[PDB]
Write a protein that binds this ligand. Structure first.
Ligand SMILES: *[C@H](C)[C@H]1/C(=C/c2[nH]c(/C=C3N=C(/C=C4\NC(=O)C(CC)=C4C)C(C)=C\3CCC(=O)O)c(CCC(=O)O)c2C)NC(=O)[C@@H]1C
Ligand SMILES: *[C@H](C)[C@H]1/C(=C/c2[nH]c(/C=C3N=C(/C=C4\NC(=O)C(CC)=C4C)C(C)=C\3CCC(=O)O)c(CCC(=O)O)c2C)NC(=O)[C@@H]1C
Ligand SMILES: *[C@H](C)[C@H]1/C(=C/c2[nH]c(/C=C3N=C(/C=C4\NC(=O)C(CC)=C4C)C(C)=C\3CCC(=O)O)c(CCC(=O)O)c2C)NC(=O)[C@@H]1C
Ligand SMILES: *[C@H](C)[C@H]1/C(=C/c2[nH]c(/C=C3N=C(/C=C4\NC(=O)C(CC)=C4C)C(C)=C\3CCC(=O)O)c(CCC(=O)O)c2C)NC(=O)[C@@H]1C
Ligand SMILES: CCC1=C(C)/C(=C/C2=NC(=C\c3[nH]c(/C=C4\NC(=O)[C@H](C)[C@H]4CC)c(C)c3CCC(=O)O)/C(CCC(=O)O)=C2C)NC1=O
Ligand SMILES: CCC1=C(C)/C(=C/C2=NC(=C\c3[nH]c(/C=C4\NC(=O)[C@H](C)[C@H]4CC)c(C)c3CCC(=O)O)/C(CCC(=O)O)=C2C)NC1=O
Ligand SMILES: CCC1=C(C)/C(=C/C2=NC(=C\c3[nH]c(/C=C4\NC(=O)[C@H](C)[C@H]4CC)c(C)c3CCC(=O)O)/C(CCC(=O)O)=C2C)NC1=O
Ligand SMILES: CCC1=C(C)/C(=C/C2=NC(=C\c3[nH]c(/C=C4\NC(=O)[C@H](C)[C@H]4CC)c(C)c3CCC(=O)O)/C(CCC(=O)O)=C2C)NC1=O
Ligand SMILES: CCC1=C(C)/C(=C/C2=NC(=C\c3[nH]c(/C=C4\NC(=O)[C@H](C)[C@H]4CC)c(C)c3CCC(=O)O)/C(CCC(=O)O)=C2C)NC1=O
Ligand SMILES: CCC1=C(C)/C(=C/C2=NC(=C\c3[nH]c(/C=C4\NC(=O)[C@H](C)[C@H]4CC)c(C)c3CCC(=O)O)/C(CCC(=O)O)=C2C)NC1=O
Lengths: 46, 160, 66, 169, 48, 48, 161, 97, 161, 161, 160, 161, 160
């Protein structure tokens, strides 16, 4: 016991897990377009 | 502005400014009080101008707010309501400078390629500029709607 | 390849020259089809009289193949 | 670094001339405003550690993209670095206010500032708004102290705006 | 204005100090390989 | 053209033209300019 | 604009010797993966404007560079930034068909790092756009083909750094 | 230690200067003016390289290879002239066989 | 090229805001001085060749420079010099009405530190011909404009040295 | 110099979200393959000089590079080429344990192309040198970790070319 | 030791020991009972292991056994047999210290300068401790043989 | 630093052969003129402050480079330029004994086209000052050694160009 | 040479040349006619030196002939004399320069790794130049062996 080293090596890789995949995604603005957003929300009633 | 457009025209001919050109600056500088007074009516009431011309564009082109559109939903319409803030800022920079080069460097050169990449129809946002001409003339005077409205008719032909 | 054949007549219009200056006046260059609207807009700014235009090679009104 | 006096020295030294009538009246124009320069520089440093704190809370309440995780003012690692990097713009505006011209601003803060911020990803955009929120204000504490304000006390601040920000028109 | 430029090579300073960046950067500046006690961090850290 | 490039807006007008049309219209657009045709002529070898 | 095949030829040119076993061992590995390279380079050319409109959407759109003050504000640059972003997609497609990253140094990576300092456009902001462009291609041409696409994308941002 | 041309003094002096005469896109975009070849200062071989923030519209000032007054910036109606004995030899085609 | 009208616009645009009351106040300071600048341009362009003639006779003629050995010998090197002083006069008056020396950073002072070195032009004589040109054009335009003309002459005069 | 821990968290920092289930799936493979990473790291450090001895004997000796005229002729340059060949074994093992190739972007590929084009070092002889020890290490640490070590060598060899 | 190398880097950056870095000590105090179960095996089997691996060494290099060589005679074996006895003491000191550092303070930093003056071919004692590595790993378990072999492989690369 | 000896040896070393008859044929012309150059150096360093004093007074004194606005005006810069021109007298005597102009490339001529435009100091007046310093040192060292001295003065003037 | 070591010691103080130090250049030139006569005589029997002195090396070092050591067959012993031909080229480079700095910058400055990483020991190459030393004296005169032998022991001092 009291192993000098730890972990199960496992079967494979860690080689190509480097490239992440995600829908960032895009940029709905949300901040300083608030004044513009209010006008757009206000416009919706029509 | 007026003088730095006429300087760079007078550099390619390699000559001083003509007396037929210098009275243009002389008339513009003395008529500088009136054009600033045009510009405050644009800035001081611009929440009326965007909201009315935004309603006029979506009635003249109701295909924009449809599903499958560019300005569809609450968020994507809000920048098309904010893009008309940007073009109205260039007209009220233009009438103070009296010329077209503060408009021409900021919003005219790359605008064929810009909205091409973003997926919007270019003439539809250019149609809302034409509706923004009509509201900005309605709050303006007799002579002032013709002088300050001429740069509005520049910009519709800029994109088209 | 649709090569036009153009016969121009270009005056001096200022800056008189003791040279040959006959090749600059009345020449008979042949131009390709794509490079002619830039050519014909250039030849009007010198006040040139375009005299004879004949499509030397190429089918008139073809659809494919240059 | 290079005073309005010493800028007029090598405006006259390189042509090899003495001090004529134009030298004696432009330099007197600097000295009649020198009482108004120094007393404005006292009250700018009256609450200069507060003046950056009132500006940046008025900045980040105005541009809330720069707080939520976007452009770099996100952590207090960025935010307290932002208040320091704001504070150089207030402190060097005090020097050129006393020095007359902007040549202290020209070769202490402006040179390399387009190239320092690009190497970090710091935007040049709201930095212009950060000087634009101070130059209008700085004028509040000059006005509430009773000193006149206008020609100068902006001579320095928009030289940090018109030369730092890139030319559009 | 600005009349020259030194260059604008991206420089990035870490926002963090985690264990596999600090154990490596404390072993890079000594200009050596990763010694046998430095592997004992990562054999403990990855096991945990 | 027998000269260097004139500045930035004279070169930005050429860089977008080879970004879209290609190299074959870059070498076209030098030649049918006014500064090629009216400073050299239509029967001269260019010179620096 | 020499490829990976002429690179083995030019490496066997200066040595003066013929094609040995290890000289052709790096040559059959091109022909094994060559059918993947010719197929995937069509689909990037099919979506060569949907990638650029997504890569600036993933990083650059609605950010602070598109705010007034930044480089992505005036249409006149915005469109330069898009055209400069259009080269890096196309020259990555030229590089992946060649199998050689020396396409880009001879052509696009020679004077790019100092031209961007002469304009003042942020280098470190450009890298996240090319890093986001590496993501959206890898979701388009599959997992394996984005690995060799991502080598030449990472060659540009390392040369830009 | 392979940057042979010095770094700081070429830009500590340059801050007091105006914008130095080079190509608009840096010194590495400026070929050596010889008969042929298109040699360039390659920025990766020996680091010549030095950016400069150039404007929106700039005019590089160039020297007329020939007559001094016959620059086109003074008289644009004199650029169609022959440069004469000062400049290089201009060729033209007259006799066709 | 930055006009003093456009410099307030380029300042107020990059903050994103519209025209403030303080930014409008700077243009009215320019427009009140607009009569004094456009008076100064038309009183120069009528006799711009005369100022050149009166400035070379004050400082340059009968000197070492116009003698053999000097640089204004051999009339190739004299007609070039007289148009050279015509260039600084023509570009000062553009910088007058612009109210901002940004023309001189762009179209004037680029190579003039190196082109005069690379042509053998002594800078120590053309920097005195500029100051001799300022001392005659202050007498020709007036005492009020000649200080404000003298700003954009000394911007050239400090740029040459 | 940012690692796989930093690149995951900064992918969730600027998103503002927590650790989402795709990223722990990445983080599980980083933590469970540690005894593969330690066993690979302790054996390359076990014979660091044997590997670079067999690397230059694979591809560099008895070429024209060792023959006078070549860029390994003096014993200065043979010690230099073998120090630099050791550095691509140190920094490859550094990026092995951090799991990200961004160490090589900051540390070793910053001025590598600036050095080797200033001394005239043959780059095409170096890209087979690091490719030679790709075989030697994978025969030493096994086929599993040599596949893992082969990426960082190929990331160096992509940046080399 | 494992403590000392982890002190003199954290001291050199002028901080405390960070709690990601304490766990190299927190691990090894549990396995200190393992290493004293390892070091007792190698010391008692040492006087067995010295009298065949030297004889295993002399097969692949016999000219040092020959006259002219530096190990000729029984009195010229205690220069070599005690030296491998000297080196396994540093191996067992490297076992108990946890890391390789007592050999750096004792046994490596002058071996190029020592055996040049002693006339010994230095490439043999690397082969001699290569003979030490192959038979000492057989005497223990494979978990011990992987860990104790790593201290041997630094002493391989010591003289190489 | 390279010698005329090392310009024979290393030109015979990069071929990889021993000294031929043509290698000693450059040495014997150097050894037949080695006794002349050692007398040549000790009479220049005897009058090194006297060589500079006439050559400054010949080329550029009572000119418009020392009158104000000229680059050698202020006493920092007048004491700079004589300290600047003292290098070109000294580093030519360093290379006259060496028989080799490649002294000047490692020490003087490398960063000398720059830091002369970068301070705006005139190149054309400096080359005018070196070329008249050639004609004052011909009168001291004699006619024959000044031919071997004038080669390294023209090597300064060619690479400064 | 003397001259390129004269000047690089004058740049370290940034002075001119010392006049007593100028005599060591003048002594270098006038004592140069007899120095190059040494160099062609070593060149004229460079194969006769090497094929003799290689033979007395292998009787002194039998490890590199009996199999087990470093360099063998035709395939590495011809490369072993390719090293010794390079060192003989360096000494006749050093004699015409007068100093050991052509041997310093070319052939001794990295020697303690390029054999240390390459498996062969150092001291037999130091016995090889000593084998080359004994046949270099025997071709020359008495005083010529004293000057040319002063470069051979520099090769022994840098290696071993
Ligand atoms: C008050 C009971 C609650 C609270 C309110 C609060 N905070 C701020 C301002 C900031 N808060 C932060 C927070 C952090 N920075 C960090 O690095 C971390 C660790 C990851 C945290 C949690 C920062 C940077 C600011 C300043 C920028 C900003 O405006 O957000 C305000 C605004 C103050 C003002 O008006 O100037 C308020 C009201 N903070 C607390 O801790 C309580 C939960
Ligand atoms: C805060 C309101 C703004 C902002 C600031 C910000 N700055 C930095 C980092 C630096 N700022 C400087 C600037 C100067 N250094 C100088 O010497 C001078 C002249 C006196 C100036 C103007 C420098 C050098 C740095 C780098 C760090 C350092 O000081 O050594 C940061 C840190 C970036 C990071 O994320 O690490 C921040 C956040 N950024 C904004 O968004 C605001 C507009
Ligand atoms: C050896 C396998 C190859 C080779 C090497 C070589 N290099 C030099 C000179 C230098 N090499 C480096 C290498 C690095 N520097 C770094 O900073 C890093 C990352 C940490 C590496 C890998 C450097 C800086 C130099 C300059 C000298 C120095 O280290 O101080 C030489 C000598 C060149 C000369 O002309 O003197 C040689 C021979 N060259 C080859 O041919 C091999 C392919
Ligand atoms: C022979 C007396 C000794 C010996 C020689 C030996 N050398 C090698 C391999 C190489 N030797 C060199 C030698 C030099 N290289 C230099 O650049 C210089 C200065 C100009 C010298 C003196 C080099 C580079 C090598 C590598 C191969 C090559 O030349 O291309 C071997 C072969 C080693 C092998 O394992 O193949 C041998 C046998 N070794 C001895 O035992 C003698 C003491
Ligand atoms: C001052 C110069 C200037 C211009 C020209 C400009 C255009 C601009 N328009 C944008 C978006 C947009 N603009 C529109 C606008 C429209 N779409 C429609 O359907 C309508 C017909 C039309 C206007 C009435 C839409 C829908 C988007 C979002 C596109 C997207 O995010 O995919 C964006 C990206 C988000 C942003 O930063 O706002 C830019 C940069 N920005 C500038 O700074
Ligand atoms: C070397 C062989 C050669 C010849 C001869 C030649 C003639 C020539 N004569 C021309 C014009 C002319 N020639 C004349 C002629 C005259 N004035 C009159 O009206 C009379 C009828 C005639 C009396 C001598 C006039 C008036 C023009 C100018 C026409 C115009 O531009 O309106 C022009 C066009 C303008 C020009 O480039 O000069 C050419 C090319 N070119 C050549 O290369
Ligand atoms: C063939 C290789 C090659 C590339 C790639 C290239 C880009 C390039 N980009 C330029 C400007 C520019 N480039 C950009 C682009 C960007 N700025 C940003 O913020 C974004 C990160 C990025 C777009 C993705 C912008 C906004 C400008 C305008 C800069 C200004 O006007 O101040 C310019 C100067 C203007 C011109 O094109 O005439 C060049 C030469 N040039 C080349 O020769
Ligand atoms: C070698 C080629 C060359 C020439 C020709 C040359 C001429 C030259 N003539 C000058 C003046 C002059 N030249 C004249 C000459 C004349 N005035 C008249 O009325 C007569 C028509 C005429 C001759 C008969 C006069 C009067 C001046 C002085 C102007 C004055 O007093 O206002 C000057 C200015 C002062 C001077 O340096 O002398 C130059 C440079 N310089 C040259 O390098
Ligand atoms: C404002 C922008 C501007 C500058 C700076 C300018 C300088 C200028 N001066 C030139 C020649 C010259 N310029 C001078 C001028 C002078 N040398 C002297 O001795 C006098 C001190 C001084 C004038 C009085 C001389 C003598 C030459 C002829 C040098 C030659 O041709 O070799 C030339 C080359 C010929 C040409 O293309 O005109 C340029 C470009 N041109 C410009 O458009
Ligand atoms: C651990 C730190 C340490 C070192 C480095 C050490 C070296 C060491 N080696 C010695 C002798 C020696 N050691 C050797 C070495 C060898 N014989 C062979 O044939 C083999 C090639 C090789 C060993 C396997 C030889 C030949 C001598 C006698 C040298 C002579 O008599 O000239 C001696 C003198 C006698 C003695 O006290 O043992 C010392 C001190 N002692 C130490 O305590």
């Amino acid at each position: 016991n009291g192993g000098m080293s730890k972990t199960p090596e496992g079967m494979t890789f860690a080689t190509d897990y480097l490239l992440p995949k995600s829908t960032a995604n895009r940029r709905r603005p949300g901040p300083n377009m608030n004044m513009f957003r209010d006008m757009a929300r206000q416009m919706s009633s029509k | 502005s007026i003088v730095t457009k006429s300087i760079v025209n007078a550099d390619a001919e390699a000559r001083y400014l003509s007396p037929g050109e210098l009275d243009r600056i002389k008339s513009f500088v003395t008529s500088g009080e009136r054009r600033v007074r045009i510009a405050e009516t644009m800035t001081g009431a611009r929440e009326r101008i965007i909201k009315e011309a935004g309603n006029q564009l979506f009635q003249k082109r109701p295909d924009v707010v449809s599903p499958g559109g560019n300005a569809y939903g609450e968020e994507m319409t809000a920048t098309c309501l904010r893009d008309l803030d940007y073009y109205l800022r260039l007209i009220t920079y233009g009438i103070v400078a009296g010329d077209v080069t503060p408009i021409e460097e900021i919003g005219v050169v790359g605008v064929r390629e810009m909205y091409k990449s973003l997926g919007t129809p270019i003439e539809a946002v250019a149609e809302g500029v034409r509706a923004m001409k009509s509201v900005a003339t309605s709050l303006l005077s007799g002579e002032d709607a013709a002088e300050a409205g001429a740069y509005f008719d520049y910009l519709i032909g800029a994109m088209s | 390849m649709r090569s036009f054949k153009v016969t121009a007549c270009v005056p001096s219009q200022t800056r008189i020259r003791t040279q040959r200056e006959l090749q600059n006046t009345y020449f008979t260059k042949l131009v390709p089809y794509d490079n002619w609207f830039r050519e014909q807009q250039r030849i009007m700014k010198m006040g040139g009289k375009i005299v004879k235009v004949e499509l030397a090679t190429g089918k008139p009104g073809t659809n494919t193949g240059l | 670094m290079r005073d309005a006096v010493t800028s007029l020295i090598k405006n006259y030294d390189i042509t090899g001339r003495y001090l004529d009538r134009d030298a004696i009246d432009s330099l007197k124009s600097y000295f009649v405003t020198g009482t108004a320069r120094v007393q404005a520089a006292a009250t700018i440093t009256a609450n200069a550690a507060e003046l950056v704190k009132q500006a940046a809370s008025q900045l980040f309440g105005d541009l809330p993209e720069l707080i939520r995780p976007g452009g770099n003012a996100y952590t207090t690692r960025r935010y307290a670095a932002c208040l320091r990097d704001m504070d150089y713009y207030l402190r060097y505006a005090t020097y050129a206010l006393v020095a007359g011209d902007t040549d202290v601003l020209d070769e202490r803060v402006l040179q390399g500032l387009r190239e320092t911020y690009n190497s970090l990803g710091v935007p040049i955009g709201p930095t212009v708004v950060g000087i634009g929120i101070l130059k209008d204000l700085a004028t509040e504490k000059v006005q509430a102290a009773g000193i006149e304000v206008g020609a100068y006390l902006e001579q320095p601040f928009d030289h940090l705006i018109s030369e730092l920000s890139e030319t559009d028109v | 204005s600005v009349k020259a430029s030194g260059g604008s090579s991206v420089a990035r300073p870490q926002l963090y100090k985690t264990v596999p960046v600090s154990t490596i950067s404390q072993a890079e500046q000594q200009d050596r390989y990763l010694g046998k006690t430095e592997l004992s961090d990562l054999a403990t850290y990855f096991s945990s | 053209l027998g000269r260097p490039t004139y500045g930035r807006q004279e070169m930005n007008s050429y860089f977008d033209l080879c970004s879209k049309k290609g190299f074959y219209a870059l070498v076209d657009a030098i030649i049918d300019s006014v500064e090629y045709n009216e400073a050299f002529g239509e029967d001269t070898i260019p010179y620096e | 604009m020499q490829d990976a095949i002429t690179s083995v030829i030019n490496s066997s040119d200066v040595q003066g010797k013929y094609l040995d076993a290890s000289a052709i061992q790096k040559l059959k590995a091109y022909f094994a993966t060559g059918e993947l390279r010719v197929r995937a380079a069509t689909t990037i050319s099919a979506n060569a404007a949907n990638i650029v409109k997504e890569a600036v959407a993933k990083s650059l759109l609605y950010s602070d560079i598109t705010r007034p003050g930044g480089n992505m504000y005036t249409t006149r640059r915005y469109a330069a930034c898009i055209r400069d972003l259009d080269y890096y997609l196309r020259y990555a497609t030229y590089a992946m068909l060649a199998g050689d990253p020396s396409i880009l140094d001879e052509r696009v990576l020679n004077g790019l790092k100092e031209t961007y300092n002469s304009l003042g456009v942020p280098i470190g902001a450009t890298v996240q756009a090319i890093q986001a462009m590496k993501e959206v291609t890898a979701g388009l041409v599959g997992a394996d083909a984005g690995k060799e696409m991502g080598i030449y994308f990472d060659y540009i941002c390392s040369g830009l750094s | 230690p392979f940057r042979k041309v010095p770094q700081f003094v070429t830009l500590f002096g340059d801050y007091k200067q105006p914008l130095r005469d080079q190509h608009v896109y840096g010194i590495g975009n400026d070929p050596l003016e010889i008969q042929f070849g298109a040699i360039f200062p390659k920025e990766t071989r020996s680091p010549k390289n030095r950016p400069a923030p150039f404007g929106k519209d700039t005019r590089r000032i160039l020297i007329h290879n020939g007559a001094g007054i016959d620059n086109q910036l003074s008289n644009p109606g004199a650029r169609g002239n022959a440069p004469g004995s000062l400049g290089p030899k201009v060729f033209k085609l007259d006799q066709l066989p």
